[PDB]
Design a protein around this nucleic acid. Structure first.
Ligand SMILES: [Mg+2]
Lengths: 115, 17, 81, 141, 86, 100
RNA sequence: AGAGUGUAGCUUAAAAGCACCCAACUUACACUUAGGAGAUUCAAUUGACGCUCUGA
RNA sequence: AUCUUAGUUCAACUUUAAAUUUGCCCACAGAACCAAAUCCCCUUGUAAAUUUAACUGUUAGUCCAAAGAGGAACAGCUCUUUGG
């Protein structure tokens, strides 16, 4: 029959060849995921429609932020083929109570202040 | 159960010739 | 007829999606916390949010009624003189 | 008077309070394996050809008293260790210790063939007349 | 249509995304005083603001969770020393 | 027919609630778990259900089991599953009734 | 002479656990027992009188 | 279930109004002697779920992927199941 898929953990094991291929690092991982939907929930089982409805990814591309904790990754490992995950980058730090209304997210995934 | 390490603990038929 | 002849454009589209999802694989093999560290850190917010839902659900009731609104309907015969 | 300050919830940290009132829970069930463990203080007699030991132990495996022929204070009054008289003496000592230990109740759960044997019946009768009883009260629900 | 190139140069894929075209004020008065901003700009400022507030809130919660774990490890690893005396 | 578990591990089961309905003895009764004539397992004491693996020592009064254990090599044992209910509440408390 | 050095036949006992013994044991006897017998090998941790073993 | 399969009643699903507080997802643990997965919950992402009052309407559908039983492993074949 057709059933949920339990992905073996072996795939989610970055190698020494993958690390220098994307801008990441084993130690000191990244706080937040910026996730976008690039595929339709239609034509896919209901246990993916519901997940997408839960992560706030209902609309199309429209990026949305989530924690990088396993409780959410378990959800993103089910919808990993209908989304693009990039790591949010903060090369100027979290904004203060000033500069909340003057932020901007660039296509490279960096949140910055005053454009 | 079958998907647990404790599986096959109750076997005894093989203990009879 | 029934069989098809998979083009090159389709292959390139499929490889694009495969690469995107391989990057997704990579960005999920390094979580900030572990199972035990995270446990409970969001409890306060979840409890307060559900309490907000409860307070919204338990506030339904008919709206007030004012004498002014009832007497305003006499304006439907206001005349000059 | 202020000195009458009493907690309206009196506690009793005693580990045998509800036990002796016959209100403590006996662990029921296990209706597919002998021995049953619907008791509080079980007696067990180990009979190995060198020594014989009669022990009384709580439901949780805790030995509350013992009477073993390994004791030098009881080795002397014996030319062997498998005689019925050995069982008599060790059971009498066990009864004395139980009486001096605050345990005047018991359960004995022998095995049908081991129960029919007169050898352990001698010990059973000796300990019974010693002062302890081989049967417990009913729980008071 | 060079969305691939635009994303390869840190720009928005869609020239109507974020850039000088879409967010600078489309007009001013003749004298020089600026114009009441456009609805689209207000809505994008509001949504970016909400995005930033969510970012700071989630990051704060995760850091506070790490600190709480540190505290619990302290008070369970060290309070066992209080049983190592007397 | 529905001969399967009806309260799974880590469930709060009150007195008398059926833990498992079975045909053969798949799950043997344990602490505070009683059996009916139809081999249903029910919770004698209010608490939390757990499942364990233990050693099996059948009644000598029974025959189809007392003999098979007699056909086993040195150092052998029949292990089997059990379902217990760790009780939750204490039996009772003592409260002031009269101050005389 | 002498290298390891030694719990009764056995060992993970600090003076312990196992069958060898015997006896009535419905369709035989082991099972179930009536009952009985075996060591810190010795002088004060160290050395030798015992053993597989070492030149003879 | 029905002198019943050209229909009805009950359930399941749907709708409205109302009350309350947990509902879904979900790791670790756990479910027998004789492969896919399933069940169950702490957290976590969410905002829904249960209960009550009141009605109607639909009901034994087609195709595709998959695992089976019948007809070859075919006859575009009858049927059950997971998904779309
Ligand atoms: Mg759960």
């Amino acid at each position: 029959k057709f059933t949920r898929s339990r992905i073996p953990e072996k795939v989610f094991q970055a190698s020494p060849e993958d690390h220098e291929k994307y801008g990441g690092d084993p130690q000191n991982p990244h706080k937040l995921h910026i996730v976008t939907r690039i595929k339709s929930t239609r034509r896919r089982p209901y246990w993916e429609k519901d997940i997408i409805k839960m992560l706030g990814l209902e609309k199309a591309h429209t990026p949305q932020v989530h924690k990088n904790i396993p409780s959410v990754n378990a959800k993103l490992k089910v919808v990993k083929h209908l989304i693009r995950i990039k790591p949010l980058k903060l090369p100027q730090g979290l904004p203060a109570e000033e500069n909340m209304s003057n932020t901007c997210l660039k296509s490279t995934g960096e949140l910055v202040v005053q454009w | 159960y079958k998907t647990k390490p404790t599986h096959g603990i109750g076997k005894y038929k093989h203990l009879i010739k | 007829r029934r069989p098809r002849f998979v083009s090159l454009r389709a292959k390139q589209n499929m490889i694009r999606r495969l690469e995107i999802e391989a990057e997704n694989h990579y960005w999920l093999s390094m979580p900030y916390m572990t199972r035990e560290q995270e446990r409970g850190h969001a409890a306060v917010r979840r409890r307060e949010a559900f309490e907000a839902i409860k307070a919204a659900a338990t506030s339904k009731f008919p709206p007030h009624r004012f004498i002014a609104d009832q007497l305003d309907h006499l304006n439907v015969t206001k005349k000059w003189s | 008077v202020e000195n009458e300050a009493v907690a309206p919830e009196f506690t009793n940290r005693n580990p045998r309070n509800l036990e002796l009132l016959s209100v403590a829970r006996k662990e029921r069930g296990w209706r597919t394996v002998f021995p049953s463990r619907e008791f509080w203080h079980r007696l067990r007699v180990i009979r190995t050809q060198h020594h014989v030991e009669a022990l009384v132990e709580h439901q949780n495996g805790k030995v509350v008293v013992s009477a073993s022929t390994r004791e030098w204070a009881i080795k002397k009054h014996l030319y062997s260790t498998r005689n019925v008289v050995a069982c008599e003496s060790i059971g009498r000592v066990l009864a004395q210790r139980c009486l001096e230990a605050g345990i005047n109740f018991m359960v004995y759960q022998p095995t049908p063939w081991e129960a029919a044997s007169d050898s352990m019946k001698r010990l059973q009768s000796a300990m019974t007349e010693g002062g302890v009883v081989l049967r417990e009260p009913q729980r008071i629900y | 249509a060079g969305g691939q190139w635009r994303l390869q140069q840190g720009l928005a894929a869609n020239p109507s995304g974020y850039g000088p075209l879409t967010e600078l004020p489309d007009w001013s008065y003749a004298d020089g005083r600026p114009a009441p901003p456009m609805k689209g700009q207000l809505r994008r400022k509001a949504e970016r603001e909400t995005f930033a507030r969510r970012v700071v809130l989630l990051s704060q919660e995760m850091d506070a969770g790490l600190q709480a774990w540190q505290l619990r490890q302290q008070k369970l690893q060290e309070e066992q020393r209080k049983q190592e005396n007397a | 027919r529905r001969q399967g578990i009806k309260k799974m591990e880590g469930h709060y089961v009150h007195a008398g609630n059926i833990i498992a309905t079975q045909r053969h003895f798949r799950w043997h009764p344990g602490a505070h778990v009683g059996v009916g004539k139809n081999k249903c397992l029910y919770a004698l004491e209010e608490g939390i259900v757990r499942y364990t693996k233990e050693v099996y020592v059948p009644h000598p009064r029974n025959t189809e089991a007392v003999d098979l254990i007699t056909r086993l090599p040195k150092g052998a044992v029949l292990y089997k599953t059990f379902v217990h209910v760790v009780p939750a509440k204490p039996e009772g408390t003592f409260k002031l009734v009269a101050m005389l």
